[PDB]
Amino acid sequence: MYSDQTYEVIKNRTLENINLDIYKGEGSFLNNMVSGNNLELSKIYLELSKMHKMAFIQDTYNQFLDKRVNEFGVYRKLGTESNGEVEFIGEKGTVINNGTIISYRDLLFVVIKDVTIGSEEGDNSPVQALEVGKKYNLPTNCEFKLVDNISGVTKITNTRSFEGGTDIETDEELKERFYKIQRNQATSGNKAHYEEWALEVDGVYNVKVYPRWDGPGTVKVLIFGKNNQAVDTETIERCQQHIDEEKPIGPTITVVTPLPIEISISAVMKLEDGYTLDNVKESFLESINTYFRDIRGEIIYTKVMGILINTTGVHDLSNLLINGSTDNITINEDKIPSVTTVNFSE
Amino acid sequence: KESFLESINTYFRDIRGEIIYTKVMGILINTTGVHDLSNLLINGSTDNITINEDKIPSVTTVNFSE
Numbered sequence: 001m002y003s004d005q006t007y008e009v010i011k012n013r014t015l016e017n018i019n020l021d022i023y024k025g026e027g028s029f030l031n032n033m034v035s036g037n038n039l040e041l042s043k044i045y046l047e048l049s050k051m052h053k054m055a056f057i058q059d060t061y062n063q064f065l066d067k068r069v070n071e072f073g074v075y076r077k078l079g080t081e082s083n084g085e086v087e088f089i090g091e092k093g094t095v096i097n098n099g100t101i102i103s104y105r106d107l108l109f110v111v112i113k114d115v116t117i118g119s120e121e122g123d124n125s126p127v128q129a130l131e132v133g134k135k136y137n138l139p140t141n142c143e144f145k146l147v148d149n150i151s152g153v154t155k156i157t158n159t160r161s162f163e164g165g166t167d168i169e170t171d172e173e174l175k176e177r178f179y180k181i182q183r184n185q186a187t188s189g190n191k192a193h194y195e196e197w198a199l200e201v202d203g204v205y206n207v208k209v210y211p212r213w214d215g216p217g218t219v220k221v222l223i224f225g226k227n228n229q230a231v232d233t234e235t236i237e238r239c240q241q242h243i244d245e246e247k248p249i250g251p252t253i254t255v256v257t258p259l260p261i262e263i264s265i266s267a268v269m270k271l272e273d274g275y276t277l278d279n280v281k282e283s284f285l286e287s288i289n290t291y292f293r294d295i296r297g298e299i300i301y302t303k304v305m306g307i308l309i310n311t312t313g314v315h316d317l318s319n320l321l322i323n324g325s326t327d328n329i330t331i332n333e334d335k336i337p338s339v340t341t342v343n344f345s346e
Numbered sequence: 347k348e349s350f351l352e353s354i355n356t357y358f359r360d361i362r363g364e365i366i367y368t369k370v371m372g373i374l375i376n377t378t379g380v381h382d383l384s385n386l387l388i389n390g391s392t393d394n395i396t397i398n399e400d401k402i403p404s405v406t407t408v409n410f411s412e
């Protein structure tokens with residue numbers, strides 16, 4: 001191909017193309033024109049080889065990828081600026097106006113709202129990164145410094161880690177994203193397609209779909225908030241409207257929120273020395289709350305009493321009763337145990 | 347059975363005073379491979395037994411079933 005086509009090869013080819021009495025000689029004037037044209041033609045061959053690659057969907061550049069995705073209607077992500085809140089410590093009554101820039105090392109951060117040291121609202125003010133990037137996502141407790149000294153301001157530190165700083169999307173990321181988009185398109189009523197739109201709601205984390213719950217075409221949408229806790233009613237409403245904005249033709253949609261199950265417990269236990277009823281009560285309730293957060297399936301009475309005895313301050317235990325029974329209690333779907341009654345006696 | 351045997355052996359190494367029947371069932375339920383248990387009897391009984399002087403607990407019979 002064009003790699004085979006070179007200065008020497010095309011030069012000899014052109015020399016053969018000419019039927020002339022002049023013997024071919026190095027440095028001849030006619031040889032000079034032929035050699036110059038062949039050099040520029042070889043350069044043009046290299047350019048053609050390059051525009052092979054530049055015309056492809058892959059191995060594009062910033063402008064090339066931009067044009068391709070604009071033809072596809074896709075747009076690359078420039079990233080987002082980091083956002084956090086810092087604390088200003090210094091002379092009381094000092095007013096830090098909006099637009100003030102605080103520098104941590106070489107990083108530059110700007111204060112959004114006015115903050116007064118010693119004010120009733122406090123000395124905490126949200127601070128946004130001047131530019132996008134992971135480097136702007138500063139951790140907690142960073143000693144920010146004013147670029148411009150302000151009288152009355154001494155120490156600037158963030159009580160929370162800076163977040164929201166996202167980097168510039170790379171070409172490969174956008175290429176793979178576009179390839180996935182073309183590969184997987186929105187369908188009418190696929191479980192994954194419908195569930196993804198529900199996943200866009202911030203409040204909910206886990207989404208489940210129960211089709212045929214009320215006959216053909218009937219879809220029962222099941223949602224789960226933070227660690228499968230029930231979200232607020234307004235969150236349910238906004239999720240319902242959102243999924244209706246993307247729902248297929250003629251579906252019946254019901255959003256189901258997780259339910260809590262109250263738990264009442266009672267036992268007659270012996271407490272270890274130096275420990276009171278309140279301490280063992282709080283420790284065991286925290287432990288059993290963790291267990292409820294991790295319990296899969298139904299309740300295990302033996303596991304409950306095991307976490308009870310393993311709790312510090314339990315000399316011995318007896319007469320353990322949960323919800324009026326000592327048997328294993330079945331947990332149904334969308335039901336999470338909730339600690340409500342703790343009847344502990346020594 | 348072997349895992350609970352090791353657990354009860356180290357507990358007896360660490361035990362003092364009396365064997366606690368609730369402690370026995372707690373160390374049995376916490377044992378790996380144990381889902382649910384019932385009718386746990388020590389020497390056929392459900393009561394704590396005092397470990398007297400110059401005396402140590404000794405495991406003799408292990409009866410576990412489903």
